[PDB]
Every structure is written in C-alpha cells, then in structure tokens.
Amino acid sequence: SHMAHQDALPRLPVPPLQQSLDYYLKALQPIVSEEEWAHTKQLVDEFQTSGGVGERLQKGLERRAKKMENWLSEWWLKTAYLQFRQPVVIYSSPGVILPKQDFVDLQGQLRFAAKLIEGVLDFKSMIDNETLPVEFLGGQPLCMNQYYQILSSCRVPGPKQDSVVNFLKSKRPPTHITVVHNYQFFELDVYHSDGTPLTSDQIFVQLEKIWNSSLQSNKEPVGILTSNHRNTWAKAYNNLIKDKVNRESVNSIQKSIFTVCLDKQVPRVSDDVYRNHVAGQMLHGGGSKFNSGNRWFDKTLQFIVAEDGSCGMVYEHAAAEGPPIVALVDHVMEYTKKPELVRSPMVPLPMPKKLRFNITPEIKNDIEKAKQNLSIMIQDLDIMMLTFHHFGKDFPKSEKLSPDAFIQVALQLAYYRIYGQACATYESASLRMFHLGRTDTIRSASIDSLAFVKGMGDSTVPEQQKVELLRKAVQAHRAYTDRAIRGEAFDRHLLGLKLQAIEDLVSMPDIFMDTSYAIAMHFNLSTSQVPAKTDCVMFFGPVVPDGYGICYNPMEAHINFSVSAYNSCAETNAARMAHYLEKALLDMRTLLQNHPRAK
Ligand SMILES: CC(C)(COP(=O)(O)OP(=O)(O)OC[C@H]1O[C@@H](n2cnc3c(N)ncnc32)[C@H](O)[C@@H]1OP(=O)(O)O)[C@@H](O)C(=O)NCCC(=O)NCCS
Ligand SMILES: C[N+](C)(C)C[C@H](O)CC(=O)O
Known part of the structure; x- marks a missing residue:
C-alpha cells in the first residue's frame, strides 16, 4: 500500500520464548491428559534451558526479524x-x-x-x-x-x-x-x-x-x-x-x-x-x-x-x-x-x-x-447455514461482555455438550497492526472455558456460580484476543521455531514431535469472525477430517453463522453442531438474565 503508511507501522515482533511456552502449556491443560501434559512440561523446560535448543532457535528468529520486513x-x-x-x-x-x-x-x-x-x-x-x-x-x-x-x-x-x-x-x-x-x-x-x-x-x-x-x-x-x-x-x-x-x-x-x-x-x-x-x-x-x-x-x-x-x-x-x-x-x-x-x-x-x-x-x-x-x-x-435471529452483539454488550468471546465460549459449551470433552479450537486473529501482518491463533479452549462448560452442565452447581464461571471464561478469551492481535500469542511463534530448526539443519526438536503438539494443532473446531455492514456470511470447509469449519458475522440484532463438516466422519454433523450452538447461546443469555448484576 502507500509506502508512507506502511513505513510507520511497527514490525512483527518475536514473542519471548519463555512466555510463549508458558501460554502453550496453559492452553494444553484442557485438551490433553495429565500424563501428556506432565511429559510436555518436561520437554518445555529442557527446550528453554540456558544454552539449549530453544534458545538457539529463538536467537535465529530474532535475526530473521532484523533482516526482513x-x-x-x-x-x-x-x-x-x-x-x-x-x-x-x-x-x-x-x-x-x-x-x-x-x-x-x-x-x-x-x-x-x-x-x-x-x-x-x-x-x-x-x-x-x-x-x-x-x-x-x-x-x-x-x-x-x-x-x-x-x-x-x-x-x-x-x-x-x-x-x-x-x-x-x-x-x-x-x-x-x-x-x-x-x-x-x-x-x-x-x-x-x-x-x-x-x-x-x-x-x-x-x-x-x-x-x-x-x-x-x-x-x-x-x-x-x-x-x-x-x-x-x-x-x-x-x-x-x-x-x-x-x-x-x-x-x-x-x-x-x-x-x-x-x-x-x-x-x-x-x-x-x-x-x-x-x-x-x-x-x-x-x-x-x-x-x-x-x-x-x-x-x-x-x-x-x-x-x-x-x-x-x-x-x-x-x-x-x-x-x-x-x-x-x-x-x-x-x-x-x-x-x-x-x-x-x-x-x-x-x-x-x-x-x-x-x-x-x-x-x-x-x-x-x-x-x-x-x-x-x-x-x-x-x-x-444458521441465522441466529434471537440476538446479536446487542445482548453481550448489554452484559458488559465481548460479543466474540461470548460466541466463542458458547461454541465451547455446545461442543462439550455433544462430546463431553473440550477440543483444540482455532479462531483467526488479525495481526494487521503490524507491517504485512496476516494472522495468529486464538485458542478458545482454555482452562476457564472448560471450567465453565463443566460447571454449566453440573446440576449441583448454583446458577449464581455458573454466571461467574461464564464471565471469567469470556474475560479469559478477551485477554487472549488482546495478546493475539498484539503479537503476543504463541502459535505462529512455535511454528517459526519449528521452521527455524529446519533451516538451521538441526534435528527436529522433540517438543514439536510431542503428542501434545499434534493434538494442539489438530483443530476439531476451526473458526473465524468476519464482521461486515452487509448482511453477508462466509464459510469454509473443516481443516481436519473429523472437525468443523465455523464462521460468523456478528451483527447487532442477529448473527450469521455457517457450520461445515465432512460426511466421511460419522462423529460430526453440521446441523447438530449448529443446533447445539444456537441452544448454547440462548442458555447463556438465559443464565445471565436470571441473575442481573445491577443491584
Ligand atoms: C478477534 C476479533 C474478531 C475481535 O474483534 P472485536 O471487534 O474486538 O470483537 P468484540 O466482540 O470484542 O467487539 C465487538 C463489539 O462489542 C464491543 N465490546 C467488546 N467488549 C465489550 C464489553 N465488555 N462491553 C461492552 N461492549 C463490548 C466492541 O466495542 C464492539 O463494539 P461495536 O459493535 O460498536 O463495534 C479481532 O480482534 C480480529 O482478530 N479480527 C480479525 C479476524 C479475521 O482475520 N477474520 C477473517 C479470517 S480469514
Ligand atoms: C478458515 N481458517 C480459519 C482455517 C483460515 C482463516 O480463514 C485464515 C487464518 O486464520 O489464517
């Protein structure tokens, strides 16, 4: 674009190595077993130690940043x-x-x-x-x-x-x-x-x-x-x-x-x-x-x-x-x-x-x-294709909650209600605040989202409690989002470390061959939001054989949804996922309305 504009935009940074590994471990907890998490935890420690492999790769990424736009x-x-x-x-x-x-x-x-x-x-x-x-x-x-x-x-x-x-x-x-x-x-x-x-x-x-x-x-x-x-x-x-x-x-x-x-x-x-x-x-x-x-x-x-x-x-x-x-x-x-x-x-x-x-x-x-x-x-x-007419960004906002995070958390609830477990979830995050920035990854499956989905279906947990869990899940997702758009996420960083390893001609680090990483990068839920003034909607196929492709246009009074799946996978059904999503969104509204904050 206009050279002058681009020249003033900051360059894509390289997140701190220890920081991205920390966020990686936290994002893994809800999608992997204790055994696998404990294993990955050790790999990370070794990977980031002084004079270790990870440190050398990080140095390389930083050199790459100083010699490219x-x-x-x-x-x-x-x-x-x-x-x-x-x-x-x-x-x-x-x-x-x-x-x-x-x-x-x-x-x-x-x-x-x-x-x-x-x-x-x-x-x-x-x-x-x-x-x-x-x-x-x-x-x-x-x-x-x-x-x-x-x-x-x-x-x-x-x-x-x-x-x-x-x-x-x-x-x-x-x-x-x-x-x-x-x-x-x-x-x-x-x-x-x-x-x-x-x-x-x-x-x-x-x-x-x-x-x-x-x-x-x-x-x-x-x-x-x-x-x-x-x-x-x-x-x-x-x-x-x-x-x-x-x-x-x-x-x-x-x-x-x-x-x-x-x-x-x-x-x-x-x-x-x-x-x-x-x-x-x-x-x-x-x-x-x-x-x-x-x-x-x-x-x-x-x-x-x-x-x-x-x-x-x-x-x-x-x-x-x-x-x-x-x-x-x-x-x-x-x-x-x-x-x-x-x-x-x-x-x-x-x-x-x-x-x-x-x-x-x-x-x-x-x-x-x-x-x-x-x-x-x-x-x-x-x-x-599902047109959620019940409401749009209007309700989440009236509750002082991020619409996108509300929607993402709802998706997590819908999935958990269907499969009884969380899954690697991907949500497109724009990195355009940086020169030539494209995207990074926001992981909707988190420790707080899992605590909410579980407590939500727990008939032994007070509705007042589910409310707290819901807001915390939404806030956790908004915090992750703020970090992602600012280049503080870790997915692209970890990818960069992997590619850097290949370029350095060093053996593929175990952390990248770890089962937890394979699971983390296998997105059963691949999603994105594409805002627009036009009442349009976008869609794309799932990124994995046994996953879903979900895209939406959050409007003020309604939300245009799209849900895709592959028939080759009996465990997935577009109509069903969409129905559970619609119901999850409504249950969350019901839950919040039953317990107003204002006095
Ligand atoms: C992740 C992403 C979609 C979040 O966007 P966002 O605008 O912050 O979404 P939010 O739901 O938080 O905000 C939507 C609206 O709710 C408002 N809002 C957010 N939090 C609020 C809160 N707690 N209380 C009241 N209002 C709130 C926002 O101000 C905004 O207001 P608007 O309707 O006047 O515009 C964005 O950062 C991004 O990365 N977009 C690019 C995605 C992409 O690349 N898609 C295509 C992939 S091919
Ligand atoms: C559809 N999906 C999420 C797989 C790809 C996005 O559109 C682009 C991206 O997030 O890089």
Missing part, C-alpha cells in the same frame, strides 16, 4: 497456502453469500452485475490512488498491503508449490475483467481509451453481448480443472497452456482485475435447505452439472451472480483474509444501492473478446477427472 510473512504464505496441495476449493478458498437481490429477469441479473462491476472499479480507484482510508483494530493503524493483492491477481499451479502473480502495478496494468457464462470466458474491458471507467449502463450493454455469445453449455468446462488437486492441476495446467490460443486465454483470465460468474438456473430445492445449497454454489459451484465449471478458482476475486437473484463470491485465500474482502463487499453493495443518476447516451462499444479453448483428448480426460474429483469433494461436504 516480516519474519513470518513468507513462511506463513508458503506453509499455509502455497505448499498446501489439497484443492483450494472448499479446503482453502472461502465462500461468501451476499444478500439476495430483487432482479426477476435476465435484464435485472445483468443490471445488478453491471452495477456490481462498476462498484468494484470505484473501490479500485482508491487502491490505484492509494487514497483508501486507514483502518484500526486495537486502536492501532492497520496494514493495508492485502488490498494490493486482491485485484488483478491470480494463483498459479506449481508442480511442487504454487505461486501468485500480481499485475496491479505492472508496466501496463490490466483494464479488463473476465466474465464467465455457461463455462465460456470473455475478456471484458471496463475502461475507455482516455483511461476512464465504463458506466453501469455501458458494462450492461457489454454483458448482453457476452451473454448472447454463450447461450448454451456446449463448451467443455475447462475451468473445472482449477478445482482438482494442486499437483494434478499443475500438470493439467502445464499441458493446457501448450496451445497458443489456450495460453492466451489463461493469460487474460490471470491478468483480469477480477472475474464475474453469471451462473445458470439450478434445480428448485426445498426451502429448508435452500440457503445451504446457495452456500455450496458459492463455495464450489454445486457440481460439474451445475455451475462448478463456470468458475476459475485460481483467480483471487470471483463474484457470482445467480439467475434466481442469489449472489456471492469465493476468493483465493493466499491473497488475503476476510476483513479486506468484506470491506470491498460493503463498498460495492452500498454502491449498488446508489440511485441511477441522469442516464446519458453511450456510443457503440467493441465486442467483448471470447477466450476460446482448444480441447484435445488429453485435456478432455483431465476435465473428466476434475469432474470426478469435485463430485467426491461435494458429496463429502456437509453444510448447515
């Missing part, structure tokens, strides 16, 4: 995404469901699409001019680098690891977006020769041409290839671009500012599962027979406009986290609600270029394989 940046990007070989679909690229629009016909669909496109270009103007407003979190300025990674970017399949291309600041920045309809991609210029952006009416005109240029799905769904395994896609991709035309098509897609997907009509399903299917449409596309082929999952920003008024998006996670994405969403949506000014006449426009694809037997085979793979992934995904 961010000691964690590249390591995280690589281990978290670039070296993650599983398909980006469902497993990595988050999905977003925006408020359903009111258009009732094709003209309306394109009308909103044209407006949305223009709204993105308006937001993009603040990026190209570095005039984008500064953001705060803990009362500190926030890194804006992510905003310069989302547009005109695209992920690239790699045989060993993937890469990312960014053309935003290239010699001649892209002035075109890509539009996908019935599996056919089109190169659409959204800027005039003089350098001014096209109008909503103009973009609309072009969308019509594009639409009439792909009235049937008689073209192979090449884009579906991008949903396969990264290793497989890498090879299929390397073959695909061997044709001049093909490479030219891919290149355009990769350089486009962003992609707009004009999805087709889907089988009218029951209302009790509608929202869930829409979530799937945005996350993976529904399937090869639906809209999955009308995508390109390597593209950083993909906006989706359904035929039934439904809309949303899916973005490639390597570029950024949710906050930056939603800020863009809020702006665009708020822009689509701008009263159309005086309609001015527009001269003829050029015919959007069609990004053709030369299909061969080999490519054909790759596509079919991609279909099979994607079909398996979809059939194994269990999603449950």
